């Protein structure tokens, strides 16, 4: 459950990320397949080479999706309906995998903005990725 200080911290931290959104999502995925390879099996279609325009584009979907998420911190269930529909009904993604990716996003954000990645911000954003994950793994259609 995010507090208003959690909201302030995610809102402040997220636009500081900004245009570099798409580029950090891609790094957050590359980092995921690399440290945790079993999660490669969710994208057997995908070109998962280190170049990949694909991993990049998809890396842009994630980033966008989380922006959507920070715009409606008050109604994540409602904003995240369709993505929940996808990750829970259609892809049946195992909840451990959101925690890997979620952690991989943090390593990434911390390696790029060390000034904004304060101990408190770290706390709020982990709660956030922990809350978006629960939506994306629950079925409530």
């Amino acid at each position: 459950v995010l507090s208003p200080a959690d909201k302030t911290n995610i809102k402040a931290s997220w636009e500081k990320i900004g245009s570099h959104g798409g580029e950090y999502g891609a790094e957050a995925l590359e980092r995921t397949f690399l440290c945790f390879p079993t999660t490669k099996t969710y994208f057997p279609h995908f070109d998962l080479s280190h170049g990949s325009a694909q991993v990049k584009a998809h890396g842009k979907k994630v980033a966008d999706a989380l922006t959507n998420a920070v715009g409606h911190l008050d109604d994540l269930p409602g904003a995240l309906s369709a993505l929940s529909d996808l990750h829970a009904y259609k892809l049946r993604v195992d909840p451990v995998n959101f925690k890997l990716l979620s952690h991989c996003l943090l390593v990434t954000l911390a390696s790029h903005h060390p000034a904004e990645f304060t101990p408190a911000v770290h706390a709020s954003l982990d709660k956030f990725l922990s809350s978006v994950s629960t939506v994306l793994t629950s079925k409530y259609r």
């Binding site: 440290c35 911390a110 790029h112 101990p119 770290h122 706390a123 982990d126």
Partner: protein
Amino acid sequence: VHLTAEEKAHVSGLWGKVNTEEVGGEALGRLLVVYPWTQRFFETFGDLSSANAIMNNPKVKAHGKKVLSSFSDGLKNLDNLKGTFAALSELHCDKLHVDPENFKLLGNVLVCVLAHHFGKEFTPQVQAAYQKIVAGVANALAHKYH
């Protein structure tokens, strides 16, 4: 854990560059902020009610320093993690009641701190190796539990 030579080198190259004075207390600090229930184990360390208190508490630092060179111990005994961690695993899992899920959590905080310190240089490949390490420690610290 058994990581290869290649991996044992990604790891040791940058572990040589670490400030062993600030890195442990900051991972232990972060652990106390990000996962506030870990606070219960350290009631004696004084005031943990705020982000900056934790971060500036002197006792947090001191013990952080002790956590992190205990990681430096893991790195020198990198293929008998069980044995080198048999005293700490009975300690934590017996005298202190630490749910071993918290082992995995601390190694992730440390990883983020590693990423925070080194930035671009903390490459995915570098992380990947450091995940084997933290996972290994986490798991050796739980051996006389599981």
